[PDB]
Each structure stands twice: as structure tokens, then as C-alpha cells.
Amino acid sequence: AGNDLLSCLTFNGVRNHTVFSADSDSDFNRFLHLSIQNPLFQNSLISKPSAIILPGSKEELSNTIRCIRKGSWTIRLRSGGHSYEGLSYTSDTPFILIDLMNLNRVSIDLESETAWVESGSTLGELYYAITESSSKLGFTAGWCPTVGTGGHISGGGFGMMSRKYGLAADNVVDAILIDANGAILDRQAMGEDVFWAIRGGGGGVWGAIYAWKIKLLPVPEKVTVFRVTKNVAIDEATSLLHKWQFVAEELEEDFTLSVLGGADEKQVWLTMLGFHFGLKTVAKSTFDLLFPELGLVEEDYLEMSWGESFAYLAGLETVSQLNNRFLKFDERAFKTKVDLTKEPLPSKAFYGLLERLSKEPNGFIALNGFGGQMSKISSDFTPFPHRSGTRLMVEYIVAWNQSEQKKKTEFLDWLEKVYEFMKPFVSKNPRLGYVNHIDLDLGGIDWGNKTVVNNAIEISRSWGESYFLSNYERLIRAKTLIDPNNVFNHPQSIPPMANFDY
Ligand SMILES: *Cc1cc2c(nc3c(=O)[nH]c(=O)nc-3n2C[C@H](O)[C@H](O)[C@H](O)COP(=O)(O)OP(=O)(O)OC[C@H]2O[C@@H](n3cnc4c(N)ncnc43)[C@H](O)[C@@H]2O)c(*)c1C
Ligand SMILES: *[C@@H]1O[C@H](CO)[C@@H](O[C@@H]2O[C@H](CO)[C@@H](O[C@@H]3O[C@H](CO)[C@@H](O)[C@H](O)[C@@H]3O)[C@H](O)[C@H]2NC(C)=O)[C@H](O)[C@H]1NC(C)=O
Ligand SMILES: *[C@@H]1O[C@H](CO)[C@@H](O)[C@H](O)[C@H]1NC(C)=O
Ligand SMILES: [Mg+2]
């Protein structure tokens, strides 16, 4: 069986594969931990793949899937390995890890201003490729350079330019999807329902994206950014955050103001991240008017290329570092939760948040405003439904290093209580979420459990409608169409509709 798999792979020309090894220093273990981006799922007790396959072409990817199906393995796809819940490299059933790191080719077409992007490519590699080819082109996606396009675009992809250009998935014009039978389908082949579904319906559900075709987007040769940390007390920090929410959502689409926040007793720190599609004169004039309380000075505003701004906002030293997929910025175990809002947050919400942060220096928040282009895109244009009416995205994070692992339970408890505190102020009925911010606290499906599987649609509605709202129904239809046998599944994958043949 394990040798039948390898025999099948060899017969089909797939040669880059390594079977499980207990050797701490084996190539298997080296490849396994190479793209584990959350150390929370890195220890010895976690499930390990029986084999790791590294396909290097669309045919190798197709044949790998075909071979794996002859057996009874669970398929796991890994691009960047940034899954918050480690769903790309863990499974409660014996699984084969298909790692896509060798599928990292980016092809820029300056004549059509589009690009073909193999799904193993990271955002950083994509950004670097774009900046290299042109000074007037960029793309809208997340801020983390080591995030893989495979999972990221599959789940939407929100970033600093989303108020201008929407999500990464909102700018996909074609794609190559490899289905459960190993069929190689482009947009025309897969159909519009499936092409709709893959653009934010969540990774690991529809098949294996081989490559994305994206539209490259206009950017000025110079943009303006700032990254300013305000060190203040809770009263001022609360005033700043309460005003920020209005400034952020209301800003014109050419502007973005986001926040990173934390505390430690009396000391509160708020890192303001600013972006403007233009020069510093207009940028400073805008914030002087709308947010004079930030106390920004001329030297805070930095003019640079789009490429430089994305490296800068990511806290990288240089643009070159975008092209390093194995670069480890923060190597801490973490757990995060997210909220979307529909009504303005009361000042007391920010106050309470800051109070709880002051008691836990390992915790922090990330605040993003929607609006702009996000409110001009229809709720069903792609699976991501949180458009017009959505005000903010609020992220709560707790992170720790190896020397603090004994406080793990305490950290998680703190995060749980933070989330409970925020309940009354955020979206309700249901409490909304974001599939790229996958959260298993919401629950999960054991696909080996008959009674659960029979009621999968209703059960899955808990997280399904949080992620996709009314788009949930259409997603189920697309799923049934493209993966009726449920070859691509995980605790929160869209359920296919059953067949009476049971
Ligand atoms: C670690 C990390 C994540 C971030 C960060 N910043 C983000 C941001 O600024 N905006 C966002 O919208 N999201 C941000 N996130 C979260 C990431 O967007 C998500 O975690 C992405 O889903 C991660 O993608 P990836 O790096 O590829 O993670 P994987 O674990 O490999 O995949 C996730 C999921 O998708 C499936 N999958 C992978 N590859 C494919 C292909 N090619 N085809 C179909 N499905 C695929 C996996 O099986 C898994 O289920 C900042 C940081 C630091
Ligand atoms: C299967 O895939 C892995 C990962 O891509 C392959 O490992 C890679 O092999 C290449 C050589 O073909 C390595 O290139 C060079 O490595 C040396 C190491 O000292 C370095 O000096 C060079 O600058 C260059 O990096 C590459 O490092 C390596 N990548 C990783 C992540 O290990 C492997 O070759 C493939 N296996 C088979 C059988 O094809
Ligand atoms: C199936 O899932 C249900 C609900 O989670 C659980 O109560 C039950 O023990 C499971 N049954 C089996 C056979 O594992
Ligand atoms: Mg050894």
C-alpha cells in the first residue's frame, strides 16, 4: 500500500517523494517542519504524514492525486503552511502530504498586465516578481510575505490595498484546478460555479489549485506610507482607537489606516500603519485634517515604490527579503480569533480591550477598516460576503515562545475571555468570521462519523454561514459538482450533497 503508492508514482513519473522516518534529522522531518508556520502544531504528539510528495509540474500534481486515490489516504495540500489551525499538514486519519513548494513559478506578462502564479508561490515571491518587472504595477493581497498563494487566494486574501482593489481573489481572471480525478481544468473547463467557489470558498475543499491567473493592478511609481508607534496611557489610547474606526472606514479608497495594538500595565502601545496611493503632501494633508490627534509629523511620511512599501509594511529590511520563502520573522506559537463588525464599536469596547491587553503582554490586536472598494463589490461576486455594511475587521492574537509553553493554557484562557467580552459589540446572528482566519473553536466535522456526516450540512452551517453567509448554499452546489466523493476534506470543508446509495 505504501509501496503501491510509490510504485504508482514511479509509473507516472513522480519521483520527488519521501516516506515517514523516525529520524529526527531525516529529510522527511526536514521537509515536514520546513513550512510549519505555527509552532503550536510542531511537537511530537501531532499527527505526521505517511509520505510527503513534492510535485514539480501540473502533470505530477495530477498524477499524485490519481495515485493517492487508488489507496485510502487522506490528501493534505500545503502551499505556504500558514493555516492558523495547521490544517495543511495535520489529519486525524492517515494522510499523504502534498507539498507544493516546487510549484513556485511566477510568470509576469507586461503586455496584458496579468500573471500566471503557481500555487506554491508565496505572496513575497509574487510581490518581488512584480516589483522586479515594473514600477507601476502591484497586486492586492495580504501583508505576510511567507503566506502561500495556494491557501491565501483560495480563502479570499485581504490586505493594505483592499480598500482600493478588494481581495486577491477578487482579481483572479483564470485558474488551473486539478480535481479529484486528476482532471486539469481552467476557468472554461470547471464552469462558473466552481470558478466562483475557488475564489474565496476556502482552500483544501475543491481540489488542488495548480496556478492562479491574476490581473496586475496600477500603482503610482511612488506611494506614501508610515509606521508610527504611539506610547500612551489607556485613556488616550481609547480615544485614539474610538476615532480611528471612523477615520479608517470613511477614508477615500486611496487611503488605508490600520492599527497594531498591545499593552503592559500603565503602558499602552498603538502602531499606526498608513498607506496612500500618492505623494506625502496629499497624504499628510489628509491625516492633518481627519486625524490630527495622531500627531504625525512630516518625517513620519515616507515616499517609496509600491514594492518597497509592501516590504516595509511587513517589517522587512529590504525588498529582496520578499523573495525568501523560508525567512522566519516571528517564530512563536500562536492562537488568533477574529470578528467583523456592522455597527460602530462603543468607546467602552476599546477600553475593555486595552484593559485586558494590559494584563497580558503576550496578547495583541490588529484593526482594519473596510469600506471603499469593499463596499462597492457585491456580497456574492465571490464567496467572501462581508462587503457593504461591514465596518471593521478585528483580530485578537496571543503568541508565546518555547520558554513560555507552560503558560499556554493561561494564554488561551485569556484569548477566550477577550472573545467573550467582545460578543455584544460585534456582528451577531451569526457572529461573522473569515475563512482565511480558520477557527476550529466553532466546531468541526469528523468525516468518519456516520451520524455526523448525515447531518453535515446543518452542523457545518455554524461556521459555514459565519464565513460565507448566504453564499453557503451556492458553495454546497459547487462542491457537489466538483468533488461529489469528498476527496478534499477537513474539519470545516464545505459538505457535498449525499447520494441515496448508502
Ligand atoms: C501565517 C500568516 C497568515 C496570514 C497573515 N496575514 C494575512 C493577511 O494579511 N491577510 C489575510 O487575508 N490572511 C492572512 N493570513 C492568513 C492566511 O491568509 C491563511 O492562513 C492562508 O490560507 C494561508 O495560505 P497558505 O500559506 O497556503 O497556508 P496552507 O496551510 O498551506 O493552506 C491553507 C489551506 O488551503 C489549502 N491549500 C493550500 N494550497 C492549496 C492549493 N494549491 N489548492 C487548494 N488548496 C490549497 C490547505 O490544504 C489548507 O487547507 C500573516 C501570517 C504570518
Ligand atoms: C525534491 O524537492 C526538494 C525541495 O525542492 C529538493 O531539494 C532541493 O534540491 C536542490 C538541488 O536540486 C537544492 O539546490 C541547492 O541546494 C544546495 C544545498 O547546499 C545549495 O548549495 C544550492 O544553493 C541550492 O540551494 C535545494 O537546496 C533543495 N531545496 C530544499 C528545500 O531542500 C530535492 O532535490 C527534490 N528531490 C528530488 C529527488 O528531486
Ligand atoms: C459521532 O459524533 C457524535 C457527535 O459528535 C458523537 O457523539 C459520537 O460519539 C460519534 N460516533 C462515533 C461512532 O464515533
Ligand atoms: Mg540522524
Side-chain angles (χ1 to χ4, degrees), residues 198-272:
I198 64 175
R199 288 180 287 157
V205 176
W206 320 97
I209 298 290
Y210 159 64
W212 297 106
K213 189 183 180 178
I214 61 179
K215 181 65 189 182
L216 298 184
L217 308 166
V219 289
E221 285 194 304
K222 300 294 181 178
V223 298
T224 307
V225 293
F226 57 80
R227 179 182 61 210
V228 178
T229 293
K230 311 293 296 184
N231 297 300
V232 296
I234 186 168
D235 289 313
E236 182 180 6
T238 297
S239 291
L240 286 170
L241 289 180
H242 185 257
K243 174 163 186 177
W244 162 86
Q245 70 177 316
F246 297 109
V247 171
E249 185 199 357
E250 293 162 17
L251 276 167
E252 289 184 355
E253 69 175 21
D254 278 346
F255 296 86
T256 296
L257 182 62
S258 303
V259 185
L260 218 154
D264 188 355
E265 291 175 349
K266 289 90 162 298
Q267 288 181 326
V268 182
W269 62 269
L270 303 177
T271 299
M272 312 299 302

Side-chain angles (χ1 to χ4, degrees), residues 15-16 30-31 34 54 101-102 326:
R15 290 160 298 170
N16 202 331
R30 181 171 61 89
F31 288 137
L34 202 43
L54 276 37
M101 64 171 160
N102 284 346
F326 300 123

Side-chain angles (χ1 to χ4, degrees), residues 77 79-83 88 100 119 143-144 148 151-152 158 204 209 434 436:
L77 308 167
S79 167
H82 269 259
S83 174
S88 52
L100 307 168
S119 63
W143 69 265
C144 303
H152 186 71
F158 182 90
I209 298 290
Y434 174 34
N436 265 334

Side-chain angles (χ1 to χ4, degrees), residues 220-225 302-306 308-310 312:
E221 285 194 304
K222 300 294 181 178
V223 298
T224 307
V225 293
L302 307 183
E303 291 185 339
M304 61 186 72
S305 71
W306 166 82
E308 284 168 323
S309 75
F310 267 43
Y312 178 77

Side-chain angles (χ1 to χ4, degrees), residues 35 37-38 61 75-89 98 100 103 118-123 127 141-160 167 176-178 202-212 329-330 334 368 393 395 434-438 488-490:
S35 294
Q37 304 296 354
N38 193 350
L61 178 49
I75 294 176
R76 280 292 178 267
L77 308 167
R78 187 169 71 176
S79 167
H82 269 259
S83 174
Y84 289 166
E85 299 280 17
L87 296 189
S88 52
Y89 52 89
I98 306 182
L100 307 168
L103 294 179
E118 285 180 343
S119 63
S121 310
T122 61
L123 302 183
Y127 294 148
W143 69 265
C144 303
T146 61
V147 163
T149 58
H152 186 71
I153 302 184
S154 288
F158 182 90
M160 291 297 293
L167 309 174
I176 300 302
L177 175 73
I178 300 189
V205 176
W206 320 97
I209 298 290
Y210 159 64
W212 297 106
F329 196 73
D330 188 5
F334 70 89
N368 282 286
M393 184 165 64
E395 305 173 46
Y434 174 34
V435 79
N436 265 334
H437 295 338
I438 198 82
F488 300 89
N489 64 75
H490 60 75

Side-chain angles (χ1 to χ4, degrees), residues 44-109:
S44 70
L45 314 107
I46 278 67
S47 61
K48 312 287 178 182
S50 302
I52 300 180
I53 323 299
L54 276 37
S57 70
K58 67 172 187 173
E59 291 87 7
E60 287 190 19
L61 178 49
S62 171
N63 290 323
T64 293
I65 294 170
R66 296 175 61 249
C67 285
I68 292 177
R69 282 201 68 193
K70 290 196 180 73
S72 68
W73 311 93
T74 294
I75 294 176
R76 280 292 178 267
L77 308 167
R78 187 169 71 176
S79 167
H82 269 259
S83 174
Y84 289 166
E85 299 280 17
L87 296 189
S88 52
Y89 52 89
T90 63
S91 170
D92 279 338
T93 53
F95 63 110
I96 302 301
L97 173 58
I98 306 182
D99 191 298
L100 307 168
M101 64 171 160
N102 284 346
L103 294 179
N104 68 337
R105 301 165 180 77
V106 171
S107 177
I108 306 295
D109 184 352

